[PDB]
Ligand binder design. Structure first.
Ligand SMILES: *[C@@H]1O[C@H](CO)[C@@H](O[C@@H]2O[C@H](CO)[C@@H](O[C@@H]3O[C@H](CO)[C@@H](O)[C@H](O)[C@@H]3O)[C@H](O)[C@H]2NC(C)=O)[C@H](O)[C@H]1NC(C)=O
Ligand SMILES: *[C@@H]1O[C@H](CO)[C@@H](O[C@@H]2O[C@H](CO)[C@@H](O[C@@H]3O[C@H](CO)[C@@H](O)[C@H](O)[C@@H]3O)[C@H](O)[C@H]2NC(C)=O)[C@H](O)[C@H]1NC(C)=O
Ligand code: CU
Ligand code: CU
Ligand code: CU
Ligand code: NA
Length: 499
């Protein structure tokens, strides 16, 4: 069952074996992935997170981010450790109490401390629309139509070298899949459909790193939502989905009753499908209970290309129709060397006092804020442009901005900008060498918003900066509850930190 919008959520350690190999994990709600948190657009969510963690090998502190929700007026509830809060300590709990005005779509939640979400703390978060403009395009939209894609590691995250190219041991679809080495015929996930019905499949990348080539043998997929943003219908036969992105697509159960492979090929780790790796099963009601015999094509004739996507609403693009045509035009220097990433010459290392608390304590400008050189101020009520030129090792890097979505003015692998009708989203591949992926948004949400690569290993190695949006209005805009003001004293006391 789905939980929320008002719910407790316990964070525990347990052994799991999603690919047949047993390892300890960090779990929300006792499962991998965690339970779906759900509500309707505009609802008040109050998720009281109980930190019950005791295994130090995966960290006993935690903090949870609600990925893609803007948190307007509730920056304190956003979750990134040392940006908007100190972590929750073990044996304590914290109510993330926020509202979701003006958003409806497919999201997710995950740990936002260190690389802890890799160890298991990841699940879906869906905000339904009772008046959804796409409602007439399908029959079924519920917990059975969510499809998660996850990387899974046999080595615990805190034992992964920083700045290394770390590789997974299994792809998991809806929590199940097979190991790339020492493969055993462990259970595969089954997605069940009824011949003739149309399904809103909500495809969620909960990846810590790889991108997936996602397809379903015999079927095509009609995209109607991108990272929470309704799209015009776009029919494709393959979706390359980068870490943390989401799509809704219509699946028409219009093929002969039978079994069909669902495929998710990562860019690293095991290649192909031998032994049923990288696979799940689409089963029609009435089909025999047996594995599919279907084949992938050698090439996919209608792959998703990001420039083909357009918003359903007339969203346009803020600013002027040329490079630098914004109130605050930025170009970030994104680099990697010797195990560490940097942005504008500075590698991100989390500060001792969270950025929001520094601002609430009176810090007057981005040069007063720590980490030095890791915080850029943005002016209020202004069009921001951010060019993100690729090249840094370990690509393609999916960049994500907290507190906002954005127009994708220029996409990967295509030098032509679009100032008319590009898709809006919240996580974007910046492409390959020589690309100049560029985003735009307007600043109507005061607070410190993290901008970072969403390959979690890269974030840990410093590939991040903080946009301190409208510093002057941050305190008046984001009143903080006593439970939030209690978090840093408790955390620093527990860890013997002075501040
Ligand atoms: C990606 O697009 C951005 C614009 O969105 C490009 O930024 C432009 O970069 C050039 C140099 O690469 C800048 O010109 C330089 O300015 C300094 C003075 O600040 C001057 O000393 C240099 O001789 C040169 O004029 C320009 O300001 C900046 N912005 C623009 C044109 O709007 C960026 O180059 C693009 N990157 C790639 C890889 O395509
Ligand atoms: C590379 O990216 C550019 C920019 O996003 C893409 O260019 C855009 O291509 C579309 C589709 O062909 C053009 O729209 C077309 O315009 C006319 C109406 O004016 C209409 O009759 C067509 O059916 C469609 O609407 C669009 O104008 C164009 N925009 C720009 C700024 O050039 C391009 O397709 C991408 N390259 C690849 C290989 O996908
Ligand atoms: Cu995220
Ligand atoms: Cu986020
Ligand atoms: Cu990266
Ligand atoms: Na415009």
């Amino acid at each position: 069952a789905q939980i929320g919008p008002v719910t407790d959520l316990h964070i525990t350690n347990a052994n799991i074996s999603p690919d047949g190999f047993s390892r300890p994990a960090v779990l929300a709600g006792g499962t991998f992935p965690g339970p779906t948190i759900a509500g309707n657009t505009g609802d008040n969510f109050q998720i009281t997170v109980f930190n019950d963690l005791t295994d130090p090998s995966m960290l006993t502190d935690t903090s949870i981010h609600w990925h893609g929700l803007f948190q307007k007026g509730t920056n304190w509830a956003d979750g990134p450790a040392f940006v908007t809060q100190c972590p929750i300590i073990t044996g304590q709990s914290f109510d993330y109490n926020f509202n979701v005005p003006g958003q409806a779509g497919t999201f997710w939640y995950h740990s936002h401390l260190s690389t802890q979400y890799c160890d298991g703390l990841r699940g879906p978060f869906v905000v339904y629309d009772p008046n959804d403009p796409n409602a007439s395009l399908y029959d079924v939209d519920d917990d059975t139509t969510i499809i998660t894609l996850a990387d899974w590691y046999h080595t615990l995250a805190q034992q992964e070298p920083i700045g290394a190219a770390i590789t997974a041991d299994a792809t998991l679809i809806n929590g199940l899949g097979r190991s790339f080495t020492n493969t055993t015929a462990s259970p595969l996930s089954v997605i069940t459909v009824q011949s003739g019905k149309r399904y809103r499949m909500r495809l969620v990348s909960i990846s810590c790193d790889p991108n997936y080539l996602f397809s379903i043998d015999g079927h095509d997929m009609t995209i109607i939502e991108v990272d929470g943003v309704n799209s015009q219908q776009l029919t494709v036969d393959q979706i390359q989905i980068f870490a943390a992105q989401r799509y809704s697509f219509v699946l028409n159960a219009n093929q002969p009753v039978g079994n069909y492979w669902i495929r998710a090929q990562p860019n690293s780790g095991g290649q192909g499908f031998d032994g049923g790796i990288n696979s799940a099963i689409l089963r029609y009601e009435g089909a025999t209970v047996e594995d599919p015999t279907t084949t992938a094509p050698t090439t996919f004739s209608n792959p998703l290309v990001e420039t083909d996507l357009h918003p359903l609403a007339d969203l346009g693009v803020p600013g002027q129709p040329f490079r630098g045509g914004a109130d605050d035009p930025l170009v970030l220097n994104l680099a990697f060397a010797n195990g560490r990433f940097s942005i504008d010459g500075v590698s991100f290392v989390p500060p001792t006092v969270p950025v929001l608390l520094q601002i609430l304590s009176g810090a007057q400008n981005a040069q007063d804020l720590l980490p030095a050189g890791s915080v850029i101020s943005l002016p209020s009520n202004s069009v921001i442009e951010v060019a993100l030129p690729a090249g840094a090792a370990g690509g393609p890097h999916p960049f994500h901005l907290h507190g906002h979505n954005f127009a994708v003015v220029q996409s990967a692998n295509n030098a032509t900008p679009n100032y008319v009708n590009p898709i809006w989203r919240d996580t974007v591949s910046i492409g390959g060498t020589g690309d100049n992926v560029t985003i735009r948004f307007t600043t109507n949400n005061p607070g410190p918003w993290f901008l970072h690569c969403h390959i979690d290993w890269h974030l840990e190695a410093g590939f991040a900066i903080v946009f301190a949006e409208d510093i002057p209005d941050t305190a008046s805009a984001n009143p903080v509850p006593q439970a939030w003001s209690d978090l840093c004293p408790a955390y620093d006391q527990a860890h013997n930190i002075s501040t």
